């Protein structure tokens, strides 16, 4: 169908959850969905489709970096007609305003990537989510009692930064954490008139060097699935 | 006191509305506020303090362009301790889904300025508003029965654009109008850890219409004004 | 007949003296012109026409920053058929070749703005004044006894710079002072085949923080005004 | 022992083969390698150590994109002591000098990414492979009677290009095909004083539209698999 | 003495005339100077010292390109104590405001080089001549009956341009001709606090296609030479 | 015949040996070629045809800097039918893998010039030599017993650099030495479907600061010549 997704047309529901790690996505399908039938597995990048509280939901891994995320989100919108893309995952905090376990809602995605300048006249595309999803995440959060931290994130092309000295500046300008796909996902979705949002769970503070225990991490990530699926319904 | 504002300490309330045009500021003061007082007039750039429905609120002009907007917003925060800034200005429409007098909430402000690359390590800063202010706008506008179209704007260094052939690309990327200040307001309020939000009344249609007169740019936007005043109550 | 000027064509003489501050424009009309009449006042941005030594001269405020200056200058030329633009204003000395009270003629205007790159093929536009005007400044300064300093200025998008460590380099390359509109005035007049020249008064030192007494501030600005009007008689 | 690789130190041979798809990596292990064990599997990104004609060969998938490829290559070098990195994979031809089933050796990787400007002082990093490895590809191919195509490639952040009009210019400048990783691999190997080369098989022509992705793939994929192991032998 | 000049110290007079062609420089020496004497000859790049109407001047060849020009101008200033640098040469006209046989004074040199952004903070350096030298050139041409055309030149890295379709836009922004060194000569002079000026003779019109007959070419150059020599007198 | 080359069509063999100093070109002709004929001399830029071991070979000087180089290389290929170009000269070493007397072969030429961004879509053009020439050089080296050092070089627009603090980082990324033309040679050849390669001999090491003597300089250079003529034998 498309070189990166194995599914037949109609295998995806119009709402889809996204993570870079497919084994993470396979863990969502099992612990949380009912029917759940693996629908794609090109390059071992798995996606699922199943039911949560009787409502249909799809899941899909997108890999690491803006370019990889862009590839999958583009095919999900144009070929599989996904209408809402809710990204979840881990991010390293850089701000004193957040700490371990927090869930960060990204109202904007800064970037050191060139992709949006190629996309957008060599100007500064402000990469933002769809507002009603952000609204929905806020409401669903409060309904569950989750202190949702809301700010920007910085999407970088480097996992191992060459500019760690710049983390303090990014925090000053209201970036609560660093990750690597939100700006690509946000730009792809504005390109293709789809509804996207990124949520991030704080498991490592790049500044206070604090970190959790591998069971607190599966604990925390579990607390994020619930909000993501409760808000897809 | 500062080079651009001559108000006493404590003159400005912690909540302030902004327009580029100090005469629209004076118009709101005279027409909407009780006990209105002019508190600053440097360079003829008026600001005012008064009460709206029993509660104190300030109004300040900020001139035209990111540079000028940044000057006033920096001083409002650092010297005058203003904590919430709400811009209610004019813009030019670029999609057909918005009309001559429509109100836009800018969830993001793209730009062709170099100012954000200067502040932000030559990377792409996603200039964005405070989310809680976004929420307050959306719900109050719904409460009040005012149509509030929500999306990105593009903040340009140019009123008379050299890139009119790109309006459609911009509109495709969820930019509902063009103005000249949102990105600076947003960037400065991120730098100084303050809450900012931009609302926009269409005053020109860059495609399928013409333009309001100078007098019309002052008096034709009372719904925006009232949305703003009601948000700060 | 434009959104930022409510004068009629013909109201502006073909040579206009420009200042960022419209109250300063008001002072000049009152003190130095005969028969001065306010001709525009949108956004409180005053402009006047009157006479000096029997010669018709217009005054117009242009606000702060290249974007604001570009707007007014574009409208003055394209609608109001102004052919000679002579800008005065204050500047912050960065170089040892000048001291407080000096009048600087800017033969070059560097910038941190992206506008000239947008205007000019993404290359480096050398923004420069009209040479005939520059000869008129020089011969008039000689007649009047003014020791006219000549060099480049740097036109910044920031009043509160994020690059103060750079002022020595800037000064090394023959930048005598920092201001905020020169590059935009020069570039707009090159685009539109008009004659333009910027003169600046050194009111304080960005590098020593020494500043002019209020009395010295008015006196040096008056000297500059007299030079401009004499230039245009 | 690294965020993205499961193996134990000493599990990787110093020579390693790389493909974006871990399923082609897994393929080579079970069709070409003697005594093949799965040394890593984080995020379903598999790696293998085995013997080929008795000699020590490792295999590792690097994901899709410059940022995905950079993470892995960085960890293989800096942690698992890999010294020679031979990437093989697919590309879309854009040059008339090559057709499908052709194999391309990238003497240079050009890029639309910003990562190398960020690595390399905002200048033009000419991302090249190690000449030794390139000498061994030309000799091995000549021995195996493989008609090797030798020129630059273009490493893009976009699989779905927004600049398809640019393909003729790249061709004229000796760019034989487009892929998404070589410029990252090459700069990461340059940063880390390692040896890398990239090899490319034409699976589709982007200009002439011709395509070969259902059966003739693994026919010529295997022809490139043999070249790679034979030059590592 | 320096890598590119082998004059002895004191061999160069503080006023030096420049050209890209060492043989045109030789032409000026033989035919206009008394007590003429070749003083340097590294790389076949000649420089001379002689006397014109009792006043000693020097001539130097500088090559083609900003890179080349910068090298010789840096050494001329820092080692051979040269204070005043006057480049004369040809240029291809692009503006209808200039015709064949016109001499152009470049009050600004725009550029497509990156050298000035490298020197200047990644900002825009408006490269300009020394005003007092420009003034002297105007005074001399007026004495000599020469109508000096004054405006900008565009100094390009390309003789065979890839952007000829842009010449109209350049001409519109007051660029009168295209050459190759002026922006470098101006930036070096500003960096090193020396007085420079570039004069320009029009032997070809890049768009009208008008051209001088080779016998008009010597006539034409000779007018510039006398002007240039007359103003160092 | 071209504005910069004085030869007739067919005055060049299709293999040319390039150096920036035309006096080193002429030195080569006297001491190494049989019956060398001077075939051009415009701008004192000498070129020659001659024989070496019964083989027709050409020599051409090209000046300093990418801009000068690109001029001559373009005319050589487009007008004078040169298909193979080999550049030799000095270069200042920066990497601790090379030392005095070493000969470096450039498999990539990085740069701080904008010329390749202009040529190549504001992206990164990996400026690389032709592979057959690089093999022929490597093989000729082995037969002559020369220890060919192989890596990137950095072509700068500056002889007197403003980023000497950056040289270590260049070395780290496999940049062996700095020169001033290689990136322009390679880019023009890639533009014009021609084959080119650069080799440079280390005279000075810009890091540790050691320098050959002008008798050691002559022998060291003679050694490179013999290499270059032998590969074009
Ligand atoms: C309010 N209206 C507009 S429309 C521009 C425009 C309209 C008509 C003709 C030419 C230009 C804006 N453009 C940038 N900021 C703006 N604010």
Domains of chain F: 15-232 (3.40.50.1580)
Give all chains having 3 or more CB-to-CB distances under 8 Å with chain A: B, D
Structure tokens at D225: 């698999």
Give the nearest partner residue to D128 out of F108, F166, F190, using CB atoms. Answer: F108
User: Is the CB of residue C206 less than 8 Å from the CB of residue E222?
Assistant: no
- Measured between alpha carbons, how far is E54 from E45 in angstroms, rounded to an integer? 26
Angle at D108 between CA D102 and CA D110, to 5 degrees: 105
Tally C-beta pairs within 8 A across C and E.
116
Q: Which of C73, C23, C66 is nearest to C158 (CA)?
A: C66
User: Is the CB of residue E117 less than 8 Å from the CB of residue E104?
Assistant: no
Our answer on whether E and C touch (3+ beta-carbon pairs < 8 Å) is yes
| Cβ neighbour number for residue F210 with a 10 Å cutoff | 13
Q: Is D213 in the A-facing interface, judged by CB distances under 8 Å?
A: yes
- Measured between alpha carbons, how far is D149 from D138 in angstroms, rounded to an integer? 9
SS (H, E, C) A74-125: HHHHHCCCCCEEEECCEEEECCCCCCCCCEEEEEEEEECCCHHHHHCCCCEC
- Measured between alpha carbons, how far is C47 from C20 in angstroms, rounded to an integer? 11
What CA dihedral angle connects A206, A209, A210 and A212, to 10 degrees?
70
Q: Which of F154, F109, F200, F64 is nearest to E74 (CA)?
A: F64
Q: Give the residue from chain A lying closest to D156, CA to CA.
A: A67
Q: Is A119 in the D-facing interface, judged by CB distances under 8 Å?
A: yes
E132 to chain F nearest CA, in Å? 28
Angle, helices D216-232 vs D131-143, to 10°: value is: 120
Q: Is E163 in the C-facing interface, judged by CB distances under 8 Å?
A: yes
Q: Is A138 in the B-facing interface, judged by CB distances under 8 Å?
A: yes
> Annotation-wise, does D180 bind a ligand?
yes
Say which experimental method was used: X-ray
| Cβ neighbour number for residue D138 with a 10 Å cutoff | 17
| Cβ neighbour number for residue B41 with a 10 Å cutoff | 17
Residue D52's alpha-carbon distances to B178, D33, D46, D85, in angstroms, are: 62, 5, 18, 16
- Measured between alpha carbons, how far is E20 from B191 in angstroms, rounded to an integer? 50
For residue C201, the surrounding DSSP H or E stretch is strand C195-205
Q: Give the residue from chain B lying closest to A168, CA to CA.
A: B120
Residue C8's alpha-carbon distances to C2, C12, D32, F157, F159, in angstroms, are: 9, 8, 84, 52, 57
List the end-to-end C-alpha distance of chain A, in Å, as a whole number.
Answer: 29
List the end-to-end C-alpha distance of chain B, in Å, as a whole number.
Answer: 29
Contact call for D157 and A20, based on CB within 8 A:
no
Give contacts of F63 with chain E, Cβ < 8 Å: 63-65, 68
Structure tokens at B102: 């429509």
> Annotation-wise, does D55 bind a ligand?
no
List the end-to-end C-alpha distance of chain D, in Å, as a whole number.
Answer: 28
Angle at F182 between CA F178 and CA F183, to 5 degrees: 105
Alpha helices in E173-213 (DSSP H): 182-191
Which residues of D participate in catalysis according to the annotation? 204
Give the nearest partner residue to B43 out of C22, C118, C162, using CB atoms. Answer: C22
Give the nearest partner residue to A107 out of B128, B163, B183, using CB atoms. Answer: B128
| Ligand 1 pocket mutation pick from B178, B203, B220 by most atoms within 8 angstroms of CB | B178
List, as own/partner pairs, every contact residues A129-132 make where C-beta atoms lie below 8 angstroms and the sequence separation is at least 24, other chains included: A129/A186, A129/A189, A129/A196, A129/A197, A129/A198, A130/A189, A130/A194, A130/A195, A130/A196, A130/A197, A131/B105, A131/B107, A131/B134, A131/B138, A131/B150, A131/B151, A132/A195
DSSP of C62-101: --SSHHHHHHHHHHHHHTT---EEEEEEEEEE-STT--TT
Q: Which atom of ligand 1 is nearest to the CA of B160?
A: 11
DSSP D149: E
Q: Is D130 in the A-facing interface, judged by CB distances under 8 Å?
A: no
| Ligand 1 pocket mutation pick from B19, B204, B207, B210 by most atoms within 8 angstroms of CB | B204
- Measured between alpha carbons, how far is F177 from F173 in angstroms, rounded to an integer? 11
- Measured between alpha carbons, how far is A166 from A169 in angstroms, rounded to an integer? 5
Based on its alpha-carbon atoms, the radius of gyration of chain E, rounded to whole angstroms, reads 17
Angle at E60 between CA E54 and CA E64, to 5 degrees: 150
Do the bridges between strand B15-19 and strand F55-61 make them parallel or antiparallel, or are there none, so unpaired? unpaired
Give the distance, in angstroms, between the CA of residue B18 and the centroid of all CA atoms in the same chain.
Answer: 5
- Measured between alpha carbons, how far is F221 from F200 in angstroms, rounded to an integer? 9
User: Is the CB of residue F120 less than 8 Å from the CB of residue F164?
Assistant: no
CA of B101 to the centre of ligand 1 (A): 14
- Measured between alpha carbons, how far is A8 from A6 in angstroms, rounded to an integer? 7
Give the nearest partner residue to E174 out of C112, C172, C190, using CB atoms. Answer: C190
Bridge partners (DSSP) listed for residue D197:
D86
Our answer on whether B and A touch (3+ beta-carbon pairs < 8 Å) is yes
Give contacts of A4 with chain D, Cβ < 8 Å: 64
Q: Closest residue (by CA) to atom 5 of ligand 1?
A: B159
Angle at D68 between CA D65 and CA D73, to 5 degrees: 115
User: Is the CB of residue A230 less than 8 Å from the CB of residue A144?
Assistant: yes
Q: Give the residue from chain F lying closest to D150, CA to CA.
A: F131
Contact call for C126 and E138, based on CB within 8 A:
no
Q: Which residues contact B97 (CB under 8 A, 6 or more apart)?
A: B149, B176
What CA dihedral angle connects A25, A31, A37 and A41, to 10 degrees?
20
- Measured between alpha carbons, how far is C161 from F187 in angstroms, rounded to an integer? 39
Instruction: Tell me the three state secondary structure of residue D73.
Output: helix
Our answer on whether F and D touch (3+ beta-carbon pairs < 8 Å) is yes
User: Is the CB of residue A202 less than 8 Å from the CB of residue A177?
Assistant: yes
Structure tokens at A155: 């999407």
- Measured between alpha carbons, how far is E72 from F90 in angstroms, rounded to an integer? 18
Contact call for B158 and C115, based on CB within 8 A:
yes
User: Is the CB of residue E115 less than 8 Å from the CB of residue E190?
Assistant: no
Give contacts of A150 with chain B, Cβ < 8 Å: 131-132
Q: Which residues contact E64 (CB under 8 A, 6 or more apart)?
A: E20, E159, E180, E181, F4, F43, F63, F65, F67, F68, F71
Residues with CB under 6 A from ligand 1: B 90-92, 156, 159-160, 178-180, 203-204, 206, 211
Residue A63's alpha-carbon distances to A66, A132, A185, B57, D27, in angstroms, are: 9, 26, 12, 49, 20
Give the distance between the most distant pair of CA atoms in chain D. Answer: 48
Our answer on whether B and F touch (3+ beta-carbon pairs < 8 Å) is no
Q: Closest residue (by CA) to atom 11 of ligand 1?
A: B160
Structure tokens at C120: 């000019």
DSSP C146: -
Q: Give the residue from chain C lying closest to B217, CA to CA.
A: C3
CA of B160 to the centre of ligand 1 (A): 6
Query: For chain A, after which residues does the C atom lie more than 2.5 Å from the next written residue's N, i.e. where is it broken?
Result: none
Q: Which of C216, C222, C223 is nearest to C100 (CA)?
A: C216
Burial of E3 (0-12, 13-18, 19+ CB in 10 A): exposed
Q: Which of A55, A61, A77, A67 is nearest to A189 (CA)?
A: A77
Q: Which of E53, E85, E105 is nearest to E188 (CA)?
A: E85
Angle at F77 between CA F75 and CA F82, to 5 degrees: 120
Contact call for B159 and C118, based on CB within 8 A:
no
Q: Give the residue from chain D lying closest to A64, CA to CA.
A: D68
Q: Which of E4, E7, E69, E16 is nearest to E43 (CA)?
A: E4
Residue E112's alpha-carbon distances to B113, C124, D179, E119, F116, in angstroms, are: 20, 6, 30, 14, 11
What CA dihedral angle connects B2, B7, B8 and B12, to 10 degrees?
-110
SS (H, E, C) chain B: CCCCCCCCCCCCCCEEEEECCHHHHHHHHHHHCEEEEEEECHHHCCEEEEEECCEEEEEEECCCCHHHHHHHHHHHHHCCCCCEEEEEEEEEECCCCCCCCCEEEEEEEEECCCHHHHHCCCCECCCCCCHHHHHHHHHHHHHHCCCEEEEEEEECCCCCCCCHHHHHHHHHCCEEEEECCHHHHHHHHHHCCCEEEEEEEEEEECCCCCECCHHHHHHCCHHHHHHHHHHCC
Residue D25's alpha-carbon distances to A93, B97, D136, D199, D218, in angstroms, are: 34, 50, 22, 15, 13
DSSP E43: G
Q: Which residue out of D78, D115, D124, D151 would a mutagenesis test of the F interface target, given it has the greatest number of F Cβ atoms within 10 Å?
A: D124
Q: Which of D224, D227, D59, D55 is nearest to D136 (CA)?
A: D227
Residue F208's alpha-carbon distances to B42, F97, F105, F160, F205, in angstroms, are: 60, 12, 21, 17, 6
> Annotation-wise, does C88 bind a ligand?
yes
Backbone angles phi, psi at F201, to 5 degrees: -105, 135
User: Is the CB of residue D184 less than 8 Å from the CB of residue D69?
Assistant: yes
- Please state the length of chain C: 233
Give contacts of D68 with chain A, Cβ < 8 Å: 63-65, 67-68
Contact call for C110 and E132, based on CB within 8 A:
no
Which residues of A participate in catalysis according to the annotation? 204
For residue D86, the surrounding DSSP H or E stretch is strand D84-93
A213 to chain B nearest CA, in Å? 31
- Measured between alpha carbons, how far is F233 from F140 in angstroms, rounded to an integer? 10
Residue C80's alpha-carbon distances to C2, C26, C51, C75, C84, in angstroms, are: 9, 20, 18, 7, 12
Task: Characterize D171-204 residue by residue with b for buried, 16 or more Cβ atoms within 10 angstroms of its Cβ, and e for exposed.
Answer: bebbbbbbbbbbbbbbbbbbbbebbbbbbbbbbb
Q: Is B20 in the C-facing interface, judged by CB distances under 8 Å?
A: yes
Give the distance between the most distant pair of CA atoms in chain E. Answer: 48
Q: Which of A203, A201, A227 is nearest to A215 (CA)?
A: A203
Instruction: Tell me the three state secondary structure of residue F20.
Output: coil
Give the nearest partner residue to F191 out of D109, D135, D173, using CB atoms. Answer: D173
For residue E131, the surrounding DSSP H or E stretch is helix E131-144
DSSP F130: -
Structure tokens at A21: 């790690």
Q: Closest residue (by CA) to atom 13 of ligand 1?
A: B159
Final resolution, Å: 2.0
Q: Closest residue (by CA) to atom 8 of ligand 1?
A: B206
Instruction: Tell me the three state secondary structure of residue C129.
Output: coil
Q: Which of D127, D114, B126 is nearest to A112 (CA)?
A: D114
Structure tokens at B28: 């709101």
- Measured between alpha carbons, how far is F145 from A103 in angstroms, rounded to an integer? 65
Structure tokens at D173: 């400048």
Q: Is C8 in the B-facing interface, judged by CB distances under 8 Å?
A: no
- Measured between alpha carbons, how far is F223 from F228 in angstroms, rounded to an integer? 9
For residue D24, the surrounding DSSP H or E stretch is helix D22-32
- Measured between alpha carbons, how far is D86 from D196 in angstroms, rounded to an integer? 6
Sign of CA dihedral A173, A174, A179, A181: negative
User: Is the CB of residue E73 less than 8 Å from the CB of residue E129?
Assistant: no
Bridge partners (DSSP) listed for residue A58:
A16
Structure tokens at B210: 């013409």
D67 to chain A nearest CA, in Å? 5
User: Is the CB of residue E60 less than 8 Å from the CB of residue E16?
Assistant: yes
To the query of whether residue E112 is one of the catalytic residues in this protein, the response is no
Tokens 């709206």 locate to B52
Do the bridges between strand D148-155 and strand D103-111 make them parallel or antiparallel, or are there none, so unpaired? parallel
DSSP of A185-206: HHHHHHHTT-EEEEEEEEEEET
- Measured between alpha carbons, how far is B228 from B17 in angstroms, rounded to an integer? 7
CA of B94 to the centre of ligand 1 (A): 10
């Amino acid at each position: 169908m498309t070189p990166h997704i194995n599914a037949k047309i109609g295998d995806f529901y119009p709402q889809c959850l996204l993570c870079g790690d497919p084994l993470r996505v396979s863990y969502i399908a099992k612990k949380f969905l009912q029917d759940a039938k693996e629908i794609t597995n090109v390059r071992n990048m798995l996606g699922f489709s199943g039911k949560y509280k009787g409502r249909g939901i799809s899941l899909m891994g997108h890999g690491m970096g803006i370019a990889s995320c862009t590839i999958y989100v583009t095919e999900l919108i144009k070929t599989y007609q996904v209408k809402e893309l809710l990204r979840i995952g881990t991010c390293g905090a850089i701000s004193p305003k957040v700490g371990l376990k927090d869930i960060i809602m990204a109202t904007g995605a800064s970037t050191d990537s060139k992709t949006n300048r190629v996309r957008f006249l060599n100007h500064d595309l402000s990469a933002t989510p769809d507002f009603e999803l952000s609204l929905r995440a806020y409401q669903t959060a409060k309904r569950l009692g989750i202190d949702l931290k809301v700010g920007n994130v910085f999407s970088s092309d480097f996992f191992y930064s060459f500019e760690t000295h710049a983390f303090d500046l990014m925090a000053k300008y209201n970036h609560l954490a660093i990750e690597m796909e939100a700006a690509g996902l946000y730009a792809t979705a504005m390109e293709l008139n789809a509804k996207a949002l990124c949520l991030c769970s704080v498991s490592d503070h790049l500044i206070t060097k604090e970190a959790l225990s591998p069971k607190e991490r599966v604990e925390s990530f579990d607390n994020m699935i619930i909000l993501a699926l409760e808000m897809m319904s």
